[model samples]
Structure formats: C-alpha cells, structure tokens
Target chain A: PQITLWKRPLVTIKIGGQLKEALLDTGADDTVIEEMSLPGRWKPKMIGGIGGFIKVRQYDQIIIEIAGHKAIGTVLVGPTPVNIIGRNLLTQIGATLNF
Target chain B: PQITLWKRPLVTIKIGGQLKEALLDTGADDTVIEEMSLPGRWKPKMIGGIGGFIKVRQYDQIIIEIAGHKAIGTVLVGPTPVNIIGRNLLTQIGATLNF
Candidate 1:
C-alpha cells in the first residue's frame, strides 16, 4: 500500500527520571509509551495486546500539549510511561504527523 | 581506553501476556526490561534513574532459564518487564556473549 500519513514535527516529552524522549508516532495504531520511565505510584490497570487481550497496565490520563495541540486520555502505563501520540490523538484534534 | 567484552548466544523468554521479544544486552550498565510487556499484577516499585532517581516501580522477580543457564533477581517493573540479563550473570557463570 502506498500512503502518506502525516507531515508534522513530532512532539517529545522528557520523562522525569531518565531524561527519556518518546517520539510521537501517530502512524502507530495504539499509543505507545515506555513503563521504564514512570513512577510506580501511578497505579496502572492491566489491559490487552497482540497475545490476545491479556494483563497489561493502564495509567491515569495525562494531558500533553504541543504547539497548538494537546490531548487527554488513559495511556497504557508500560515498563516506560511514554505516550507515542498516535492516530487516535491526532484525529481527535484534526491534525497529523508530518513525517 | 577499550576492553574486550564477552559475546554469548543470547537467550529468549516468553512473557505471559506479550508475544514480544526482548534482547539481552549485557553492555547495558543496568538491568533493562520493558514495562509494556508485563502483566499488571507484577506490582513494581519506584526507584531512581539517570534523570535523578525518582520513584520507579519494582516487580516480583521472574526466573529466566536459558541453555544451561538461569537467574533470579528483584527486577524493576517498568511499563514493560523484560530482563536485560547482564555482565554479572555472565561473569558469575563464566559465560559470555558469542556475538
């Protein structure tokens, strides 16, 4: 398939502990983040994935703001609590990745 | 200055919920795993990292066994928890990465 999905400078957020930088990849179907970069206190709920919807953790909705862009939603708290800002996010605000 | 590091055949482990793959990088100074690949109940603890050691999460140690090899430790539960079996494990067992 030939497609041109997005064309915008990605927005990155530096994680608190490790100076982690999560590049916003809206091309991805799900919001991807790393659990290795979050606080344990942010109790996440387990959810599903490739292995057929099993136990994964969920985190509180974080409000991320970019230049004239922002979003709030329940992010999956992975080993790294990063937000890969995906299709769902961009679509909500009528924007797209410019890569 | 340069040093010769051991090269061994890395092992693979299947996380309960994730049908993903984790590469064991001994070159990593710390045990690196992905929190996004674990089941939620693994209650991880919060610790510090390069961003100035803040509250990170900890998880119950999962035993990983490879070709005539095995290890156990209280690994940090990130959003993903794939163990980065490291130098200590190789040194302790007189084994090295063969790559």
Candidate 2:
C-alpha cells in the first residue's frame, strides 16, 4: 500500500495500549516517542537529531502498529518535541521512497 | 523507480552545478542548502527545524535535480548544519511514502 506524503507526513500509531500521532520521519534513524509508558526494563541512551543530543530510554522488542501494519522493534522514549516514526520501523512495513 | 530506505535516506542531488548529498527529509517543508552560491534575487526568511528557527535566504524559480528527476521550486540557503531535501521538491518529482 502507498501513503501520500502530506506536508508533514504524520501518521497514527498504537503502542503500549496508547494511540499517538507521529511524524513519518524518513530523515531519522530511529523512532523517538515523546514520553510514553512501557512495561519493561530499558537502558538510558543518547540520540542525535536535527536539534541536538537527547537522553532517551531504549526499549527493546516492542510491538507497534502503524496504519494497520504491525511490527516489533526498538522504541526510544525521550523529551522529544514530537513523536517520530523513523526508518527502523518503516522498513519493517516494507516502506520505500518512490518517484 | 523505488529507492530503498537507508538507515538515513540520503540521496545525490545536483544543484548550482555542484553535486551534493542531501537527506530526504519528510519532516521538513522547504529544501535547505548549506551556503551554496545561487544566482537569483532572494528574500530573507526563517525556517524552523527540530532545533529551532534559523535565518535563510529564500530563492525562487531555481532548478534542482534529484535521482534524475528535475524540479524547479523554492530553495532556502543559509547556515544549516546539513542539506535537507524537503517535501516541496519531493512532491514535484512525484515522490511518495509507500509500504
């Protein structure tokens, strides 16, 4: 399935029994959610974005559903200004860039 | 043609007779270049990123080539940390987000 690129490319995602809107950021390397609750042990890690480095909690093996496509991957929770779905989970859904 | 999403979706673009690598940023609205010499009249403008707002010179009616697709649109040049190809030009090339 194909998704039209909006001006912002935002999408709805469900994780941890919560539904949130996140930017479909192909520019990002990993998904960064803005302060979410999870039921597992996580390691503190640092991530670099267009802004700068941010401290994030790296949660492993989490299930995330985006536009009806489900996949398990690493999710980072941090003080991000916005929720971002990056390439890590995008590839899991077979997302590609086409012209 | 389809481009597989890299960890960071970077692509080769030709602008101002120079070849440069730019991130295919779905999160950005306008294309931003890092201090390139462009020939035209530009208006002073500001663009916001993950960090904050930065001053940029907005140039219109400029031609840029990405992955063999040619598009003429608005391009902003300034002291950007990175070169980003945003949705303005991406849509002109018929680029989309797909799975």
Candidate 3:
C-alpha cells in the first residue's frame, strides 16, 4: 500500500495480540509505542527524538503485524505523541520512502 | 527517489541558501529544524513530537530544496535533536510511504 504525505500515514498494527494504530516514521531510528500491558520481560531504556529524551521500557524480539505484514523487532514503550513504526519494524515489512 | 528503511533516510537539503542534512519524518505533522539563523520574521510557537513539546519560531512561506526537489511550506526553528523535513515539506515533493 502507498500512503501519500498529505495526511498522517497511520496504519493498523497488531502487537501482542492487541490491535493498535501507528505511524510509519522513516525519520525515527526506533519504534516507540504508548504504555500498554504486554506479557513479556522488558528493560528500562532512555531514547531521544525530535524534541527531547525520555525513559522507556524496551522489549526485544516482539512480534508485530503492520498493515498485515508480520515483523519481529524491539518495541519501546513510553509516552509519545503518537505510536510510531520506525525503521526497526519498517525494514521487516520492506517499507520504503518514495517521491 | 526511493529510500529503503535499512538505514537512516537522510538527504542533503537547501534552505535559506544553506545546505544541511535532514531526515524525512513521516510521523511529524510539521517540519522542524535545529536552531539556526534565518532572515525573516517568525512567530514564536510551541510544538510536540515523539517525546515532548518545545518552543519554536515559525517561518511561513519558506522555500526549501529536499534532495533536489523544490518545496514551499512553513518551517519551524527550535531546539531539536535533529533537523527534520516533515510532512509539510514532504507533501510538496509528493513523498509517500510504500510497503
């Protein structure tokens, strides 16, 4: 599927058997999701973004389905303006930026 | 041009006659640049992103060249972790998310 830049590139994502919406962020080096319950072990980590830095929980090798494509990667849980599907997962689904 | 998600999709951009490297952020609603000098009158603004909100200056109707394509849009100047070319500018060059 192709998403034009005129609107937010939001897509449905399934993670840990829960459905959520996230944006395909090419600028982000890592994926960050809103705080949620997941049945797994995670570690505390600090990450930075466009504005500032924040402490988050990092879960490794988590399974995620983005736009119907299944991908396994690290997903950070923290407070973010929106859920972001960064390169870590985008690469798994062969996501690309085109102009 | 098509950019793969294997690595940072960074590109050289020209804005206000200055060349700089910026990330094409599909998750950002507006463009944000690191604090820099630009000859124009901008209004103080506050914007949010992955982490938190930051105070910035908004310059409207600015011309920028991403990769090599020209675009006109509003750009924000503030304390950002990195220079980002958001949807505001990406839309001008017809950027899209393809998976």
Candidate 4:
C-alpha cells in the first residue's frame, strides 16, 4: 500500500492491548510511547532526538499492531511528547521509502 | 526509487550551495540544517521536537536537491542535533510512504 506524506502521517496502532495514535517517524531509532502499563519488567533506557535525551522504560517482546500489520518487538514507554512508530515496527511491516 | 530503512536513511543533499548529509525524517515537519549562512534575508522561527523547542532562521525559496529530486521550499537554519530532511521537502519531491 502507498501512504502519502501529509503533515505528520499519524496512524492508529495497538500496543499493550490498548489503541493509541502514533506518528510514523522515520527519524526515530526506536518506538517511544507515552506512559503505558506493561506486564513484564523493563530496563531503563535513554534516547536522543531533535530536542535531547530522555529516560524511558524499554519493554521487550511487546506486541504492536499498526494498521492491521502486527509486529512483536521492543517498545519504550515513558514521558514522551508524542507516540512515535519507529523503524523497529516499520521494517516488520515491510515499509519502504519511495519517490 | 525505493529506499530501505536501515539504521537511519542518510542521504546527501545540496543546500545553500553546499552538499551535506541529512536524514530522511518523516517525523519532522520542516527541513532543518545545522547553523549555516544563507544568501538572502530570512525570518526567525522556532521548532519543537522530542526534546524541546529551538530557535531557527527560516530561509524561504531555497533550492534543495535530494537523491536527484529537486525541491524549493522553506529551509530552516539553526543549531540542530542533526540535519533533517522533513515532510516539506519530501512532499515537494513526490516522496511517498510505502509498505
């Protein structure tokens, strides 16, 4: 399927058994979501972006479904300004950049 | 052409008569480059991202070439963590998000 680059390209995704809106961020290295509850223990991780670095909870083996395409990978939940769907899930869904 | 998301999709772009490496960032709304001098007058602006907001100089009508595709639009010059080619330029180049 083809998706147009309009504004932020926001998409609906399911994570941690809940639905949330996340931006399809090709700039981000990892998926970062707002504070969410996870079943297993997570490790403390830090990520740097356009702004700066922030601490996050790295939850592994999280099931994330983006527009009906499902992927099982790591999800970082913490105090993020917005929910971002990174390449971790994008690659799983076979996302490709095109012109 | 198809571009695979490997780590960060780095590409060479020509801006302000200089060639620089920029990340293809769908997460960003506007194209941002590190501190650089522009030929003409520019307006002051600010942009917010994962970390925080930063002051920038907005240079309009700048010609930018990315992967052989040409785009002329607003190019922000400022102190940035990285050079980002955002949606503004991407749309101009007829880039599309695919899966």
Which candidate, 1 or 4, has the higher DockQ? Answer: 4
TM-score to native of every candidate shown: 0.31, 0.90, 0.96, 0.96
Summed over model 1, clashes come to 52
A43 Cα displacement, candidate 1 (Å): 7.2
Q: Pick by DockQ: which candidate is best?
A: 3
Q: Candidate 1, fnat value?
A: 0.00
lDDT of 3: 0.88
Error of 2 at B65 (Å): 0.9
- C-alpha lDDT of all candidate models, in order: 0.40, 0.84, 0.88, 0.88
Q: Which stretches of candidate 2 lie over 4 Å from their true place?
A: none
Candidate 4, residue A58: Cα displacement in angstroms equals 0.6
| TM-score values for chain B across all models | 0.44, 0.93, 0.95, 0.94
Question: lDDT score, residue B71, model 4?
Answer: 91
Please give the RMSD to the true structure for each candidate, in Å.
15.7, 1.8, 1.1, 1.1
In angstroms and one decimal each, the interface RMSD of every candidate reads 18.1, 2.0, 1.1, 1.1
Better of 2 and 3 by DockQ: 3
Q: What share of the true interface contacts does each candidate keep?
A: 0.00, 0.68, 0.89, 0.82
Local error of candidate 4 at residue A81 (angstroms) = 1.5
Q: How high is the lDDT of residue B66 in model 3? A: 96
Tens-digit lDDT track of model 3 for B1-99: 889988898999999899999988888888999888877799988888656778999999888899999998899998898899999899899889987
